[PDB]
Amino acid sequence: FKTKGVLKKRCRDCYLVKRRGRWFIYCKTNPKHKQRQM
Amino acid sequence: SSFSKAPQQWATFARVWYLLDGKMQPPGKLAAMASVKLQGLHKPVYHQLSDCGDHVVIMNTRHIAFSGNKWEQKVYSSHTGYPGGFRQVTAAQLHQKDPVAIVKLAIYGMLPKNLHRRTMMQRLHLFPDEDIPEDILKNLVEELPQPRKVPRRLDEYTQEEIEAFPRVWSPPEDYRL
């Protein structure tokens, strides 16, 4: 996970979901694309 | 009207015990009327130097209701005086620990900040449920109306009211719920 201010999908398999009040770019193929909106 | 001096004085400055249901009621709206009745601002004979103050018995404190996300947001901060003794508890944790503490602190904050606050707080009786001793029950005079109208649930609605309410839309027969 990388805590960022601006989330952006780095590939076509990244999905944006709202959990625990925050936004999260989750990626199953490339786990390094995990982003968390601060 | 044509009373003697001592009974007239007694009748005028007599104390009254009010009852207050706190089930599904906001603690601040409870504390408003509680503090008014505690100070005596409901008497046209009121004065700050007089001891005019009525007793308030609030029941069903455990069943109190908080608006919004206050149960998880509102914190209560205390300090034991010792270094490192600063505690901040969530309202939900404080309610789970001591049920009366929420409305107690609400009324304490709504009361005036003079030395009479402790005296008129001694005339406040809070109970978590409908379990009031007989000695206190035998003192009650009237019950104050609840400040918030509790809305009914869907199961608490009568079939007559449900059928009287119109169906605003028509679901399709081929849809599956």
């Binding site: - | 608006s67 996300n69 998880e72 914190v75 969530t90 869907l154 199961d155 609605y157 028509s170």
Partner: protein, 162 residues
């Protein structure tokens, strides 16, 4: 309404669909020329989270919302009704619109705290430990800003942050 039923008779699975009778719209609406259900039954800026008799018309038996393409509400009314159904579910109205779990109904937990006009979810909000001073005060949101257009008979605006 359509129901999917399954029949197991000796390693033979039969999936069947059964259509039952459904209630229709009331015959006399007050504004028949309105394209929208709410905005033609004149309930616009009238309902709230307490109006369960209106919020329960279009929801699934498990508390879920119904699609807009199936219901027919205008987008703003759909969002308002979605937030109102969320607030009712959080406040405790509509208690029979939950899934039946006979294994999970036995292990009782801490009693449910009574609440109403809850905007966020109780499992996502963090406690405000600082609370701010008078000039910079961390206000607590109450209700939704989507219901700011409702009719105010008293004339005072609704305090959405307190």
């Amino acid at each position: 309404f359509r129901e999917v039923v399954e029949i197991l008779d000796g390693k033979t699975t039969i999936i069947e669909g059964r259509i039952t009778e459904t209630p229709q719209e009331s015959p006399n609406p007050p504004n028949p020329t309105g394209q929208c259900p709410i905005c033609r039954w004149n309930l616009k800026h009238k309902y709230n989270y307490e109006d369960v008799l209106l919020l329960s018309q279009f929801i699934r038996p498990h508390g879920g919302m119904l699609p807009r393409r199936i219901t027919g509400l205008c987008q703003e009314e759909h969002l308002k009704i979605e937030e109102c159904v969320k607030m009712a579910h959080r406040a405790g109205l509509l208690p029979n619109h939950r899934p039946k779990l006979p294994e999970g109904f036995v292990p009782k937990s801490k009693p449910r705290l009574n609440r109403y006009l809850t905007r966020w979810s109780p499992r996502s909000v963090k406690p405000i430990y600082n609370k701010g001073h008078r000039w910079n005060k961390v206000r607590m949101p109450v209700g939704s800003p989507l219901l700011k257009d409702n009719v105010s008979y008293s004339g005072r605006p609704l305090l959405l942050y307190h």
